[PDB]
């Protein structure tokens, strides 16, 4: 087995009050990649967030409310690294990576880009910087699993009424083109769309009860994995959890097992 959980909690505190800690504790998994901690590493040090039988790793942004990402693993990773050299990355700890034998996973959290124009500019900046870094991450032997919420949909199949969202951030032409270039040209794939080419599957919908009723979801979570692991995809699922997190948990299993 080889499970991976992705829950952009948008605040580990709200996650705790919503019962995310108990759900993850009950949810038997190998690695858990929650995003947007909205708290300092010292806050994550609170044993309440420490899941029984899992390690604690977290990198906080310069400003807690800005972001922050954490990573829980069942076995001691070979090494944990944070940052990518970019200001938009280092100054906010939006990237944290653990190292295991043969495969090393990472936790990515892109800026929403929907708050303001400056957020969209930062999004474009981080996108170009990240595709550059990944170009530098081509011939690298170690296979990767960039588990992160990219705040962008690849195809219309990933979001309904695209006609209305075409101009709204998250589905704009340049972001979709960047994602397509990152996926196809560079040989990267996705476990879900590979194992299950089924529409209507989303992760992030408005907290508004109306959108939840009519299910206005935007697929923002993606299990970006190097082509080496593409062959070892078991199955993907997007549970419709009752408002536990804006980004619904993204659980995927893999045929390839892990090792220290």
């Amino acid at each position: 087995a080889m499970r991976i959980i992705s829950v952009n909690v948008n605040g580990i505190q709200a996650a705790a009050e919503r019962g995310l800690l108990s759900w993850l504790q009950a949810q038997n998994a190998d690695v858990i990649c929650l995003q947007d901690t909205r708290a300092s590493a010292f806050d994550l040090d609170d044993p309440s967030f420490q899941l029984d039988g899992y390690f604690l790793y977290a990198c906080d942004a310069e400003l807690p409310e800005q972001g922050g990402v954490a990573l829980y693993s069942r076995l001691q990773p070979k090494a944990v690294i944070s940052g990518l050299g970019f200001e938009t990355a280092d100054r906010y700890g939006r990237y944290l990576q653990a190292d295991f034998d043969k495969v090393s996973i990472a936790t990515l959290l892109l800026p929403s880009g929907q708050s303001g124009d400056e957020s969209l500019n930062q999004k474009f900046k981080f996108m170009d910087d990240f595709t550059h870094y990944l170009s530098k991450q081509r011939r690298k032997r170690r296979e990767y699993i960039y588990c992160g919420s990219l705040y962008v949909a690849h195809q219309k199949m990933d979001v309904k009424n695209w006609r209305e969202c075409q101009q709204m951030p998250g589905f704009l032409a340049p972001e979709r083109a960047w994602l397509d270039e990152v996926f196809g040209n560079l040989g990267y794939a996705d476990a879900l769309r590979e194992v299950s080419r089924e529409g209507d599957q989303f992760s992030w919908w408005p907290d508004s009860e109306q959108a939840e009723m009519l299910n206005l979801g935007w697929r923002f979570d993606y299990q970006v994995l190097t082509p080496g692991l593409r062959r070892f995809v078991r199955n993907a699922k997007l549970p419709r959890q009752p408002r536990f997190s804006q980004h619904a948990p993204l659980i995927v299993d893999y045929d390839w097992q892990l090792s220290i």
């Binding site: 011939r139 040989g187 794939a189 082509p227 080496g228 062959r231």
Partner: peptide
Amino acid sequence: VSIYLVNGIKLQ
């Protein structure tokens, strides 16, 4: 070189 295969694995 980085010869890619149809199955998906890469050979350096």
